[PDB]
């Protein structure tokens, strides 16, 4: 247990964070398990994994399920005024579990965006290429790429002894004013985690939007313009407005580390806001079963079949 001093140890230590935040983590954990696990049953039992859509939808549900698994560990760590009683080997894994699954959840949504674009804008030509094998290769490459992005987290994350408060926390230490390797963690979350995934998601669903307008106007036969177009707006905007608070405060923490920001009056709010923005970043994991699942007719009837079998 390395012994260090915390530069400003009163940041984020408020009474209303040690009770409200662990409640939100537990609530998301209960809802997320109930939702995502329900989806995994349906895809394996009723959709039967016969289509490329099933492969992508299964991995997305799996990634959200694994991210929630280690949430209770962080719920009790925050509950006890930021004290880590689990040991180094557990903080090594728990930090990697969140970062690895969250990166895969974002990368998988980008793959669904591209895969949906091919199947809608090019229904004829994509039949030659969109085979089951290509889905398997894409999925494993996604998980491998998420592991390489999560690798700096499993390296730097370590348990420290804070001589200022005699409290054992496990965290990343920015010992240098530059500290280039740890701040590559900060920018990877910002560039490879929000900008590139969102540009692809925005571009693909914009081209899907144009194609459905042209397709629905040509046929002009009982079109349901309302439901298909509401879902596309709901999907794109929810991703943006559930991830943009965390990416803003991640960028601020990068400025704090470089030395651009030094006052602890606003280093207090940054460490105060970060638990909040992580709570609403998990809204994607607990609401993905709705947007990508039961908003369609197929899963609604599958769930009714499950309801009958009680």
């Amino acid at each position: 247990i390395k012994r260090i001093q915390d530069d400003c140890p009163k940041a984020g230590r408020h009474n209303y964070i040690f009770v409200m935040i662990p409640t939100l983590y537990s609530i998301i954990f209960v809802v997320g398990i109930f939702g995502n696990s329900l989806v995994v049953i349906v895809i394996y039992f009723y959709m039967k994994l016969k289509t490329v859509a099933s492969v992508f939808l299964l991995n997305l549900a799996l990634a959200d399920l694994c991210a929630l698994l280690t949430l209770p560990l962080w719920a009790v760590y925050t509950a006890m005024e930021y004290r880590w009683p689990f040991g180094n080997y557990l903080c090594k894994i728990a930090s990697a579990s969140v970062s690895f699954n969250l990166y895969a959840s974002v990368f998988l949504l980008t793959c669904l965006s591209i895969d949906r674009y091919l199947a809608i804008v090019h229904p004829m030509k994509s039949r030659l290429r969109r085979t089951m094998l290509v889905a398997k290769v894409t999925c494993i490459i996604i998980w491998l790429l998420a592991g390489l992005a999560s690798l700096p987290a499993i390296i730097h994350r370590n348990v420290f002894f804070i001589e200022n408060t005699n409290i054992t926390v496990c965290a990343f230490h920015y010992e240098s004013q530059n500290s280039t390797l740890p701040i590559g963690l900060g920018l990877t979350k910002n560039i490879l985690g929000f900008l590139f995934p969102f540009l692809i998601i925005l571009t693909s669903y914009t081209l899907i939007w144009k194609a459905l307008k042209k397709a629905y106007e040509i046929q002009k036969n009982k079109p349901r313009n309302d439901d298909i177009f509401k879902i596309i707006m709901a999907i794109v905007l929810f991703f943006f407005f559930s991830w943009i608070p965390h990416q803003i405060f991640t960028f601020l923490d990068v400025l704090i580390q470089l030395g651009i920001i030094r006052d602890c009056r606003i280093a207090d709010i940054v460490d105060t806001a970060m638990p909040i923005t992580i709570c609403i970043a998990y809204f994607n994991a607990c609401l993905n079963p709705l947007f990508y699942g039961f908003l369609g007719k197929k899963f609604k009837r599958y769930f009714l079949q499950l309801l009958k079998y009680i």
């Binding site: 915390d6 930021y82 965290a171 990343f172 230490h173 920015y174 580390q257 992580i278």
Partner: peptide, 8 residues
């Protein structure tokens, strides 16, 4: 130095 204790 800066001790970043948050989950992600």
């Amino acid at each position: 130095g800066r001790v970043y204790i948050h989950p992600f």
